[PDB]
Design a protein around this ligand. Structure first.
Ligand SMILES: Nc1ncnc2c1ncn2[C@@H]1O[C@H](COP(=O)(O)OP(=O)(O)NP(=O)(O)O)[C@@H](O)[C@H]1O
Ligand SMILES: [Mg+2]
Lengths: 96, 239, 97, 304, 200
């Protein structure tokens, strides 16, 4: 029944999240961030709005989606860099 | 026409590895493609920001209106009209090359063949991405297709320039991809912020001899050197 | 594609990603697959279709699946001193999907 | 031959002699020596190997085209089928049988599966194919010049390595070809300029009556004349071998052998000389024919 | 030439003495280059023998049912046709393992066995094996072993009574003679005079 629309989008936040994920993903062995991951943030936000049966995606859905994708990226990193990367990415996710 | 899409061996292109190790395909099948594009994630942050804004405009549904405005503005055409137009071009026109176009194409062929020869010498192996007389016919077909858009019954100099440019942008770019003593000699003898005119470095290194241009390519990729002033001045710009 | 036993002609048989169209497909022990089996996933996993062209059949099926897969790292156990691509043998085009 | 192909002069010479193969011998107890000339072009991509096959396909009186992947071994020799007119098992001629007293063209020859190439051997060795299946036990004539195109095992010929390592085919098959040609797309500015300006002249062609840019629906003979000349020479002259030619042949054969050469090389030289005598329309083979035959086989073996 | 080989090839036809078993069969393999064209020699001596048969490695017995009609028969292979005769195995290096095991049983027991489709038998194979084999990579290197040059296994080669490695060596002497002989055949459509009278 439910098909959530994106609206009021924090375009700059998702853009900065993807840009930073791409930059820090230049580490040769890391999880290979690609445009399909950018679209994945939007799919995940839509799924969270789906869980609420909400035909619009709120900021809470998008923020939870960003938290999932960033944590999934950070969790895949080796311990030598994971603290520094988690601290760097915290501005996007621990604001929620 | 065959339009084919593929990933390299190791999935991601693995830039520091040899192209002959990254590319699965034999030179036989590769030669049958008029244009081979090697596509890479540039990872440039400005580009990634731009792509992110664009993709968001797709998923938000803004792009549905944007394409319609672009079509009505005459800056774009639809699937249907373009389909009919390709059919019309394929049935009305089949242009020849003018003599001038023919000469430019011929000299371009010998030029790219020379580039491939020297690259195979510099890498001491036969190139995986080939340049062959079949690939001259690739540039011929591309020239003709470019004239075939506008239904011009002959291709001209302008169409050959664009055909050459596209082949350079695709198949050549696919093909395009002791010095340790000479580079530290240059670092020792040219300190920071000063210029060595190139020909004097060539004379000095020869007087000790092709290692020179490898050293310059490496040091130019790094920040340490900058080829100023039409390439005449080797400038120790960086560290 | 199978040679139809009663019609004596070629016909398609939908695989798991056809059966689970508008659904989920669940590949447990994903790292144990043969790589020729694994790389069949790609089209259905991103373009959400299967394009068979065999025995004179030529058509594209719908494969609208969310695939959830479970894998062990290389050697049987993870290593947090290695980055991901060295923990597991999966290549970037399948990992990105 | 093939005026739209630059260069490849020795190959076009061999092709001409292969269109005009030497006389077949029949001996005591019906023993047989073949008269076809079998050519293999192996080499780099874009070296006109397929185009030369397509010219031969358009020029011989009777030519059958084949390609390595597209050819089954059964589809090549002959196949059993039921004749629905009566209901009996009957043979259907394959490419090698249909080309009898003609030629067979094989593109992408090294791409064949070996159970296909196992069926090539009897045509080359005996000019015949033997069937022993379905209660059908027969032998069929397949007397034809095979001309084939191939690539090395690597995408291009690797001069660092031996011909048996470059070339995929068994020596038990390579020895059956009369002339094994190795060609390369070796880069050189002068040759590249020449071939390029030729190819541009070739692509600037316009057939008669068509408008500019409209889509289609130093002495040299015309292809119809050339086809007539080949028919004349095949039908009307059977060159007889002669001692003055034999002297050249034995001198050249011993010299070539006493520096890959084998006993089969000798009757190849005889075939090439006999075919060149057919080019002269002469009732005898002569010292000129043996000299040209040895020069051309020397090119093929030494890359002279 | 090759009169040592020809002298050995005769002793296949006359054979030794069998006794209560002790065996009369004698076996020979003609190894080396294909340019010697040994196949014609096998063809010749096959025609000499009153009971022999010419074959290719490209031999085993089998229940080869459905010959013409859908119908039951047991095919005794060429090694059984060669019972009390010569089996001339051309292309001997090319044979497959079923034929290798067939040759093994006849060269040891002078039988070939069946355990197929319910049929359990031993067919008689008192046969002498004449074989011809050719090297890998086309031409034999004389400094390397026959085991290096040819596909056949050593244990099988050990069971032959005579082994002839007839190589092809280029020669300013021999090649003129072979060339004149062959060119005579092409020029006169018959072989030259032999300098002796053969037995038919
Ligand atoms: N000497 C030549 N003169 C003119 N055109 C040539 C020449 N050599 C190659 N070409 C062109 O190259 C193209 C490919 O020729 P083709 O006969 O398919 O090459 P090939 O030797 O068969 N290559 P491949 O099938 O990949 O092994 C044709 O369009 C020819 O016109
Ligand atoms: Mg070809």
């Amino acid at each position: 029944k439910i098909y959530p629309k994106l609206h009021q989008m924090d375009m700059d936040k998702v853009s900065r999240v993807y840009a930073d994920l791409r930059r820090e993903s230049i580490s040769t062995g890391s999880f290979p961030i690609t445009v399909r991951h950018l679209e994945s943030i939007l799919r995940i936000a839509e799924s969270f709005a789906k869980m609420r049966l909400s035909e619009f995606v709120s900021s809470y859905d998008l923020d939870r989606a960003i938290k999932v994708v960033v944590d999934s990226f950070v969790d895949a990193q080796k311990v030598s860099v994971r603290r520094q990367l988690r601290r760097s990415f915290a501005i996007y996710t621990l604001g929620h | 026409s065959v339009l084919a899409a593929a990933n390299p061996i190791y999935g991601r292109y693995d830039d520091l590895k040899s192209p002959g190790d990254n590319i699965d395909f034999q030179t036989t099948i590769l030669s049958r493609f008029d244009m081979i594009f090697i596509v890479k994630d540039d990872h440039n942050e400005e580009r990634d920001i731009s792509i992110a804004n664009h993709v968001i405009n797709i998923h938000t549904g803004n792009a549905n209106a944007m394409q319609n405005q672009q079509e009505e503005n005459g800056s774009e055409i639809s699937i249907e009209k373009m389909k009919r137009y390709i059919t019309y071009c394929r049935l009305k026109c089949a242009p020849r090359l003018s003599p001038q176009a023919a000469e430019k194409l011929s000299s371009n062929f010998v030029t790219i063949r020379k580039q491939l020869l020297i690259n195979e010498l510099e890498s001491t192996e036969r190139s995986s991405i080939p340049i062959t007389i079949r690939q001259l016919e690739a540039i011929i077909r591309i020239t003709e297709s470019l004239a075939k858009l506008e239904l011009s019954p002959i291709a001209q100099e302008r169409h050959v320039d664009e055909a050459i440019r596209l082949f350079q942008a695709s198949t050549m770019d696919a093909a395009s991809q002791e010095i340790r003593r000479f580079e530290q000699e240059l670092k020792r003898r040219l300190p920071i912020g000063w210029s060595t005119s190139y020909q004097t470095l060539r004379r000095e290194f020869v007087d000790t001899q092709l290692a020179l241009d490898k050293a310059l390519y490496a040091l130019e990729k790094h920040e340490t050197i900058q080829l100023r002033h039409q390439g005449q001045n080797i400038y120790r710009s960086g560290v | 594609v199978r040679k139809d036993p009663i019609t004596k002609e070629w016909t398609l048989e939908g695989g798991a990603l056809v059966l689970a169209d508008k659904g989920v497909c669940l590949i447990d022990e994903f790292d144990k697959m043969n790589d020729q089996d694994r790389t069949s996933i790609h089209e259905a996993m991103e373009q959400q279709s299967i394009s068979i062209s065999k025995a004179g059949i030529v058509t594209t099926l719908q494969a609208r699946c969310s695939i959830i897969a479970a894998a062990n790292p290389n050697g049987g156990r993870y290593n947090s001193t290695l980055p991901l691509a060295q923990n597991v043998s999966l290549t970037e085009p399948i990992l990105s999907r | 031959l093939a005026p739209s192909i630059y260069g490849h002069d020795h190959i076009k010479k061999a092709i001409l002699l292969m269109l005009m193969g030497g006389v077949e011998k029949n001996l005591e107890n019906g023993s047989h020596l073949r008269g076809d000339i079998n050519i293999l072009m192996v080499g780099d991509p874009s070296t006109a190997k397929s185009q030369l096959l397509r010219f031969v396909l358009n020029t011989a009186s009777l030519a059958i085209a084949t390609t390595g992947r597209g050819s089954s071994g059964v589809g090549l020799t002959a196949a059993v089928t039921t004749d629905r007119e009566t209901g009996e098992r009957r043979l259907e001629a394959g490419a090698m049988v249909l080309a009898d007293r003609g030629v067979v063209c094989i593109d992408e020859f090294d791409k064949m599966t070996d159970v296909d190439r196992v069926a090539i051997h009897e045509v080359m060795e005996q000019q015949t194919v033997t069937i022993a299946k379905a209660g059908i036990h027969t032998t069929l004539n397949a007397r034809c010049s095979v001309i084939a195109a191939a690539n090395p095992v690597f995408g291009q010929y690797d001069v660092n390595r031996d011909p048996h390592q470059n070339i995929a085919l068994p020596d038990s098959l390579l020895s059956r070809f009369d002339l094994l040609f190795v060609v390369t797309d070796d880069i050189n500015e002068i040759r590249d300029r020449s071939i390029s300006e030729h190819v541009l002249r070739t692509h600037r062609y316009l057939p008669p009556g068509y408008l500019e840019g409209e889509p289609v629906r130093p002495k040299l003979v015309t292809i119809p004349f050339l086809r007539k000349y080949v028919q004349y020479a095949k039908e009307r002259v059977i060159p007889q071998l002669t001692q003055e030619a034999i002297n050249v042949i034995v001198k050249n054969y011993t010299d070539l052998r006493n520096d890959p050469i084998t006993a089969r090389t000798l009757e190849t030289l005889i075939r090439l000389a006999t075919a060149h005598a057919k080019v002269r329309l002469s009732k005898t083979v002569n010292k000129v024919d043996a000299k040209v035959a040895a020069n051309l086989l020397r090119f093929a073996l030494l890359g002279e | 030439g090759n009169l040592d080989v020809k002298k050995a090839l005769l002793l296949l036809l006359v054979g030794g003495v069998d006794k209560r078993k002790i065996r009369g069969d004698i076996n020979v393999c003609l190894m080396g280059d294909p340019g010697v064209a040994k196949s014609q020699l096998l063809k010749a001596i096959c025609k000499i023998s009153p009971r022999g048969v010419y074959t290719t490695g490209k031999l085993t017995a089998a229940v080869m049912k459905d010959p013409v009609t859908d119908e039951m028969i047991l095919e005794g292979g060429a090694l059984v046709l060669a019972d009390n005769g010569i089996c001339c195995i051309d292309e001997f290096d090319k044979m497959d393992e079923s034929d290798r095991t067939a040759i093994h049983e006849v060269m040891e027991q002078q039988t070939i066995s069946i355990s197929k489709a319910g049929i359990n038998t031993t067919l008689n194979a008192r046969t002498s094996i004449l074989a011809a084999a050719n090297p890998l990579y086309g031409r034999y290197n004389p400094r390397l072993s026959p085991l290096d040059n040819i596909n056949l296994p050593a244990a099988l080669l050990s069971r032959f009574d005579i082994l002839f490695l007839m190589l092809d060596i280029p020669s300013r002497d021999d090649d003129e003679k072979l060339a004149e002989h062959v060119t005579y055949v092409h020029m006169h459509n018959k072989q030259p005079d032999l300098d002796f009278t053969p037995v038919e």
